[PDB]
């Protein structure tokens, strides 16, 4: 019990690539327990359970699909099993699909409202019941700039993203007299394979293919910083959120954007 | 001469409360009108006549909002019966008020079609014409549950917020446009939606007494100590529609006795 | 006949740009206005005729804001000539352009004393009488600068933030009577306070080049490529002045062309 | 080997309260510490020992923040004692509550003075040399007071509703550098400021009982019911001052037990 999340058991969804691995990395850093997540029996990367692992807590891989109620389910019971009671929650796998509103695929926009807001629904209503019979719990949904501010062409993804940050304040505040936080991370850009390959896109429908031009046009238009943010860094956000100085920060957006949210 | 002579809107969800009032406003500043709800014989039998007593042009047309193909029938019958429809005040919306633990499944999927998707739905099958013809205005009626929080309101909180979200993509899409796309976001106003929760509370909490538990109601959240009303809700839609706001674009217009100011 | 019929308002700094259209669209909605500058002799000879052509009562009163006496002596002038001050419109403001390293003292002071305390002093001797007549409009012109920041604005963001903080608690402080306060937030307008900045951008970065430095201007921050209008600011003025913003309090109305929407 | 280890920081009036507490957190954290408020010797004769407990180097200067020349006094202390000031705190601050008619001239100008303008003063007078070497921390005390509105504090809304727009300004001027500005914005916390305030309230509204007092100042306004700590407020600060915050700039880490959430 030296490390700050010590004992503590987390879930964190989507956690094979980008920003939920970069998280699940460092609360394992930070002392706890972690419980990785994706569609995959064999995720792509196949060394996500060595790589987080390595901070000497207790790890997991269960493959489930998130916008399957069912199988959220199945991912809490697997972890209760295996490693415990949830303690922490990260509410993170999410997917994009750009296009014009005229014609957004009627699909598209469903999946990227189930995924990237009802997911998170079901799972915090899985797991409010055991943390507040424990008198504890941290629920951290990963939203983005995009659910404060809207961008062209992603109307279904700065809908949802709209909408998780509302849910994390109603509920944030139906566990504001108990020790179960709810919050919010917004990052702006970080360079994952979501937006890789929007950069890929814009680099060969109008930068003639070239892979720099389109990164600076794309993360120029929007970030002061001219930098990525990166995963360690929403990582270290969601260590900040989960330790005890953070016991009375509820319902609000931890904004990791580089300037895009100030202007 | 009125500030909307000529203007063909469509306003979901009109049957009732604020919808009817927005429809009721729009006339008054001198656009036709298309009425909306779910039913062949909506339960106020007068709607048409109370809408059609400014002078313009008024239909009704039954269609379920969560059903995209009733959608598109709502604006082909408005395309055909008054022209090309210019302003869309995206209105239907319902509640349901439960902690998180408890929140039915049903009624969150309901919630976010009804509240969220059907807008999009709506909007999409609009924009064409709107851009063809370099005029439009779309309304969505959001709610200040779509800036803050509540308690027992997950699903709509969640669906007002997104709606707002979907609002501004819609608008800076729209930027270099004649069409503007905006949110209204009234605080409480005194409709069968939220008459049903203060029963609620009454019974819950106060023996049943109405005037005690629609006080205990207002005042939790709104500092003003009265209701917004569904005429001022309209004249909100009004002032978006009218070409003082050809360049409000993106925003919420908040009509809430004060409470986001708090 | 006019929403605002026979309403006494008091637009300060309304002898150019933002303030002059609010005055003009104040008067055409049937108010009786005083206008306001710094000159016993504006350097537009005009703006009393130009207001006065929408047929009600018009006066001038020089008077500079960042004198609380001066504040005091122009509300004097009202209630003397026209009678008691109901819509009031703080609007005059300065912008200094600076890094923060170097921006002058004594410029950051005289941007906070006009563009945020001169409207708590308008403010504080408005107030007793629109209570004592229940009934009043305080509409502050802040800016989108008011809720999100520029580079080498320091002074000018903080005091329009400011200005939209005290903006809510006045509402909040007023939120059971029939007086309201409320902001209007505009993104950029032709006017003289930005054409200097635009002519400084030109000679910094573009060779004198006013067109260019114009389109280069507007499209680092707004999305509909295009200056919102002193009329459109007006029209938000009569908006939140009339019935229909009686239980609007609190709140920023803006008229930004996307600026805080993205 | 900590996290600060080597940083020299400044946290102005830390004799008390949330910058006391501030303080003891970044020593805790490994950074050098000056602390300082208004007195030669501050009414706590043991702060220095206090912080100095974490085993870094503690100083303390005597400073109105009001008088810019003895901000400048401060941070040059700071150089010649310990070294380039490198992780600026913007803590000390006061509070007046009166409503805005009888709100007192001078405590206006007084509130302005110190909780917006003492923060641009010394932020002028650190950036030239965090931008030399390359690296800062810019963290200004805001509060809730900074993003809402609540009634009788305009002065104390409006400045810290201007700190936030100033954070903002600072954080887009820097942003391509290794310096950032940010602030945090507590709710209610249990220090001095607040004890005074629920005395009123108690004297004035509940015969004197301090307990029923302050259950009803919390609950108003807080619904975690409880109290912010000093403490949190400092790991706050720790996080920002962080290499895991070099990307977070210009916002608002909000510490308030769901007020701005509902
Ligand atoms: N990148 C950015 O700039 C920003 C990203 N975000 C958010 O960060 C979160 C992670 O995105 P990022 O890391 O960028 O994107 P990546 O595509 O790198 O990672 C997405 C993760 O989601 C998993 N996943 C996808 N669909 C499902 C599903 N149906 N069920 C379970 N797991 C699923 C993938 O795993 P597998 O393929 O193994 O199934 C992968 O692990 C998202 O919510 C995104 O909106 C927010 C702001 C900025
Ligand atoms: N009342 C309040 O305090 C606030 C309400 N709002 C929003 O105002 C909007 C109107 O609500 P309000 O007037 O209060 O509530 P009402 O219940 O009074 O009116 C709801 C309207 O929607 C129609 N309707 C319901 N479901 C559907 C559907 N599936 N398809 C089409 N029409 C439908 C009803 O017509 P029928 O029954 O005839 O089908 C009725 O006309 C909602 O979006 C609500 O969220 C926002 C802020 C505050
Ligand atoms: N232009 C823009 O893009 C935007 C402007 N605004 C705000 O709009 C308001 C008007 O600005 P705008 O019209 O652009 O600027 P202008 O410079 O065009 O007008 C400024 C007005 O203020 C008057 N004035 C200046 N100092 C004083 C003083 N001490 N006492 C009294 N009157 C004074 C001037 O009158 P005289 O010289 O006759 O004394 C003039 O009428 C300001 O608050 C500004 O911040 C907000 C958003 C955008
Ligand atoms: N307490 C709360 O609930 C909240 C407080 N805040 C902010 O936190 C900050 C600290 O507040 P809090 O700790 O509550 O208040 P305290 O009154 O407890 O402490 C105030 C500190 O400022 C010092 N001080 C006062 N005037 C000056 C001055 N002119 N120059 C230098 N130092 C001065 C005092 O030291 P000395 O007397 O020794 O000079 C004391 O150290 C303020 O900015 C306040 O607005 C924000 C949100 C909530």
């Known amino acids: 019990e030296k490390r700050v999340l010590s004992g503590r058991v987390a879930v964190v969804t989507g956690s094979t690539s980008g920003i939920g691995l970069g998280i699940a990395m460092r609360l394992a850093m930070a002392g706890a327990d972690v419980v990785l ?5 064999s995720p792509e990367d196949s060394a996500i359970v060595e790589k987080v692992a390595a901070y000497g807590t207790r790890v997991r891989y269960f493959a489930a699909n998130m916008k399957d109620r069912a199988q959220v389910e199945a991912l809490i019971k697997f972890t209760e099993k295996e490693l415990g009671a949830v303690e922490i929650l990260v509410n993170n796998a999410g997917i994009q699909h750009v296009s014009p509103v005229e014609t957004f695929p009627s699909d598209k926009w469903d999946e990227i409202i189930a995924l990237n807001l009802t997911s998170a629904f079901h799972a915090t209503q899985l797991c409010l019941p055991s943390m507040r019979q424990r008198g504890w719990g941290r629920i951290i949904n990963i939203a983005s700039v995009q659910g404060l501010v809207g961008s062209m062409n992603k109307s279904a993804y700065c809908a949802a993203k709209h909408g998780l940050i509302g849910f994390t304040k109603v509920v944030a505040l139906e566990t504001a007299t108990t020790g179960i936080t709810c919050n919010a991370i917004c990052p702006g850009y970080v360079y994952t394979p979501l937006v890789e ?10 930068y003639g293919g070239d892979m720099e031009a389109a990164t600076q046009a794309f993360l120029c238009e929007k970030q002061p910083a001219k930098a990525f943010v990166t995963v360690e860094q929403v990582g270290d956000a969601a260590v900040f959120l989960a330790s005890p100085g953070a016991d009375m920060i509820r319902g609000t957006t931890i904004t990791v954007d580089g300037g895009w949210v100030a202007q």
């Open 37 to 41: 997540n994706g569609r995959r029996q």
């Open 197 to 206: 390959e929007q950069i890929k896109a814009v680099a060969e429908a109008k």
